Design a protein around this motif. Sequence first.
Motif, PDB file in Angstrom:
ATOM      1  N   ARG A  60       0.841  -1.182   0.000  1.00  0.00           N
ATOM      2  CA  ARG A  60       0.000   0.000   0.000  1.00  0.00           C
ATOM      3  C   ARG A  60       0.894   1.257   0.000  1.00  0.00           C
ATOM      4  O   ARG A  60       0.628   2.207  -0.727  1.00  0.00           O
ATOM      5  N   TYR A  61       1.987   1.232   0.769  1.00  0.00           N
ATOM      6  CA  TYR A  61       2.943   2.358   0.842  1.00  0.00           C
ATOM      7  C   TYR A  61       4.348   1.841   0.566  1.00  0.00           C
ATOM      8  O   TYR A  61       4.807   0.920   1.229  1.00  0.00           O
ATOM      9  N   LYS A  62       5.042   2.436  -0.397  1.00  0.00           N
ATOM     10  CA  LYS A  62       6.352   1.911  -0.790  1.00  0.00           C
ATOM     11  C   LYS A  62       7.424   2.002   0.284  1.00  0.00           C
ATOM     12  O   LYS A  62       8.388   1.244   0.249  1.00  0.00           O
ATOM     13  N   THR A  63       7.255   2.903   1.253  1.00  0.00           N
ATOM     14  CA  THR A  63       8.239   3.009   2.331  1.00  0.00           C
ATOM     15  C   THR A  63       7.910   2.194   3.579  1.00  0.00           C
ATOM     16  O   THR A  63       8.702   2.185   4.520  1.00  0.00           O
ATOM     17  N   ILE A  64       6.736   1.565   3.606  1.00  0.00           N
ATOM     18  CA  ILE A  64       6.349   0.702   4.726  1.00  0.00           C
ATOM     19  C   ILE A  64       6.357  -0.783   4.280  1.00  0.00           C
ATOM     20  O   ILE A  64       5.423  -1.257   3.633  1.00  0.00           O
ATOM     21  N   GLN A 105      -0.850  -4.761   6.628  1.00  0.00           N
ATOM     22  CA  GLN A 105      -1.568  -3.602   6.084  1.00  0.00           C
ATOM     23  C   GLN A 105      -3.038  -3.954   5.762  1.00  0.00           C
ATOM     24  O   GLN A 105      -3.424  -5.131   5.730  1.00  0.00           O
ATOM     25  N   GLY A 106      -3.857  -2.936   5.482  1.00  0.00           N
ATOM     26  CA  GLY A 106      -5.197  -3.192   4.962  1.00  0.00           C
ATOM     27  C   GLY A 106      -5.053  -3.778   3.552  1.00  0.00           C
ATOM     28  O   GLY A 106      -4.345  -3.208   2.716  1.00  0.00           O
ATOM     29  N   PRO A 107      -5.695  -4.931   3.290  1.00  0.00           N
ATOM     30  CA  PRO A 107      -5.612  -5.537   1.957  1.00  0.00           C
ATOM     31  C   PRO A 107      -6.104  -4.567   0.901  1.00  0.00           C
ATOM     32  O   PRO A 107      -7.028  -3.790   1.156  1.00  0.00           O
ATOM     33  N   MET A 108      -5.443  -4.586  -0.255  1.00  0.00           N
ATOM     34  CA  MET A 108      -5.911  -3.877  -1.432  1.00  0.00           C
ATOM     35  C   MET A 108      -6.664  -4.899  -2.283  1.00  0.00           C
ATOM     36  O   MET A 108      -6.486  -6.096  -2.089  1.00  0.00           O
ATOM     37  N   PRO A 109      -7.478  -4.445  -3.264  1.00  0.00           N
ATOM     38  CA  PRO A 109      -8.204  -5.450  -4.057  1.00  0.00           C
ATOM     39  C   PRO A 109      -7.321  -6.552  -4.649  1.00  0.00           C
ATOM     40  O   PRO A 109      -7.732  -7.711  -4.650  1.00  0.00           O
ATOM     41  N   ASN A 110      -6.101  -6.234  -5.076  1.00  0.00           N
ATOM     42  CA  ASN A 110      -5.193  -7.275  -5.613  1.00  0.00           C
ATOM     43  C   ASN A 110      -4.469  -8.163  -4.590  1.00  0.00           C
ATOM     44  O   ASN A 110      -3.739  -9.085  -4.977  1.00  0.00           O
ATOM     45  N   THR A 111      -4.652  -7.899  -3.297  1.00  0.00           N
ATOM     46  CA  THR A 111      -4.025  -8.743  -2.264  1.00  0.00           C
ATOM     47  C   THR A 111      -5.037  -9.413  -1.339  1.00  0.00           C
ATOM     48  O   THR A 111      -4.654 -10.005  -0.318  1.00  0.00           O
ATOM     49  N   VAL A 112      -6.319  -9.328  -1.686  1.00  0.00           N
ATOM     50  CA  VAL A 112      -7.366  -9.943  -0.874  1.00  0.00           C
ATOM     51  C   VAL A 112      -7.198 -11.469  -0.849  1.00  0.00           C
ATOM     52  O   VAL A 112      -7.273 -12.093   0.208  1.00  0.00           O
ATOM     53  N   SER A 113      -6.953 -12.073  -2.014  1.00  0.00           N
ATOM     54  CA  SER A 113      -6.714 -13.521  -2.057  1.00  0.00           C
ATOM     55  C   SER A 113      -5.501 -13.931  -1.222  1.00  0.00           C
ATOM     56  O   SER A 113      -5.539 -14.965  -0.534  1.00  0.00           O
ATOM     57  N   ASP A 114      -4.437 -13.137  -1.315  1.00  0.00           N
ATOM     58  CA  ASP A 114      -3.222 -13.294  -0.512  1.00  0.00           C
ATOM     59  C   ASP A 114      -3.558 -13.265   0.977  1.00  0.00           C
ATOM     60  O   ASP A 114      -3.093 -14.114   1.735  1.00  0.00           O
ATOM     61  N   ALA A 229      -1.892   1.002   7.101  1.00  0.00           N
ATOM     62  CA  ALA A 229      -0.476   0.781   6.845  1.00  0.00           C
ATOM     63  C   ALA A 229       0.099  -0.381   7.647  1.00  0.00           C
ATOM     64  O   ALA A 229       1.196  -0.844   7.341  1.00  0.00           O
ATOM     65  N   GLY A 230      -0.633  -0.841   8.661  1.00  0.00           N
ATOM     66  CA  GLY A 230      -0.272  -2.053   9.409  1.00  0.00           C
ATOM     67  C   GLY A 230       0.787  -1.834  10.492  1.00  0.00           C
ATOM     68  O   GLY A 230       1.384  -2.793  10.974  1.00  0.00           O
ATOM     69  N   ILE A 231       1.027  -0.584  10.883  1.00  0.00           N
ATOM     70  CA  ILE A 231       2.116  -0.266  11.850  1.00  0.00           C
ATOM     71  C   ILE A 231       1.664   0.603  13.043  1.00  0.00           C
ATOM     72  O   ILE A 231       2.032   0.314  14.173  1.00  0.00           O
ATOM     73  N   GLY A 232       0.868   1.644  12.789  1.00  0.00           N
ATOM     74  CA  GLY A 232       0.514   2.616  13.851  1.00  0.00           C
ATOM     75  C   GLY A 232      -0.465   1.984  14.827  1.00  0.00           C
ATOM     76  O   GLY A 232      -0.120   1.672  15.958  1.00  0.00           O
ATOM     77  N   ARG A 233      -1.691   1.794  14.372  1.00  0.00           N
ATOM     78  CA  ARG A 233      -2.753   1.253  15.208  1.00  0.00           C
ATOM     79  C   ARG A 233      -2.536  -0.214  15.559  1.00  0.00           C
ATOM     80  O   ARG A 233      -2.840  -0.627  16.673  1.00  0.00           O
TER      81      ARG A 233
END
Length: 293
Positions: A60-64, A105-114, A229-233
């Motif tokens: 979702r974020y290239k630096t995370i 991270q929150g899944p994006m439409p292309n990583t939901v299956s993942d 982003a899967g890090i803060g919360r």
Amino acid sequence: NTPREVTLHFLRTAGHPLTRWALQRQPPDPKQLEEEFLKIPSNFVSPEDLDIPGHASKDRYKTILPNPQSRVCLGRAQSQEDGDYINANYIRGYDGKEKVYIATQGPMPNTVSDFWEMVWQEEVSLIVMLTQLREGKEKCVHYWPTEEETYGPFQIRIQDMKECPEYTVRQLTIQYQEERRSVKHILFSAWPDHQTPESAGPLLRLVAEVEESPETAAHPGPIVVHCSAGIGRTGCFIATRIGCQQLKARGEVDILGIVCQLRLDRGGMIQTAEQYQFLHHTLALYAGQLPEE
């Protein structure tokens, strides 16, 4: 030592254990807590330290990015695309117990299956989602069905759903080939990105909801915790849980050490000094709620 080895030495050795009494009655002041938080290395990995061709389209974020030594690697359940990559890490729990959580991270439409492949393969029975429900367009796609959807080889069906204050509980079944498993999904809706909830009460009730959730897999697997982003919360939630566990078992808590251990597992866990301060608030509240009794 190198900057990398300086980082790792700090994260392995920093500590500020507080007795329950100190936390409740004579806590570090907010300036002290901020200075303490700012000293903790992020332990972010750079794109250059990852050699995983094709990973960028799944971030979702290239630096995370997921620290390679603890990243969750997907198996070979999908035939639509290759790769073992998901932006997710295993996170140690109380006393350094392995793989108690996965932070993703929150899944994006292309990583939901993942995402569902991870849930399947890791024998996950509980997902904790942290978000702020707002009106309008959504940053993160709904990767769960209203009733029934198929995601790659996985069929997901809602069994039941209920509302509690500040969170929704969904009971799901996930089907892969001829096999079905139950998964509990908790959607906590009052945590804005880069901020804290208004009150710690609902967060402690969420932690209680987590504690009371049965394991439903053949073997114990990690609790999945996610936010955009899967890090803060995710970092705030997991630290809260481990903190409560320390307070209950030992009558003390080392919040600094908890956060350092999270950062060894995934870069950037807990984003702001305000979140770090709110963590102390939340654990002080928990200490006041402990049974007398």
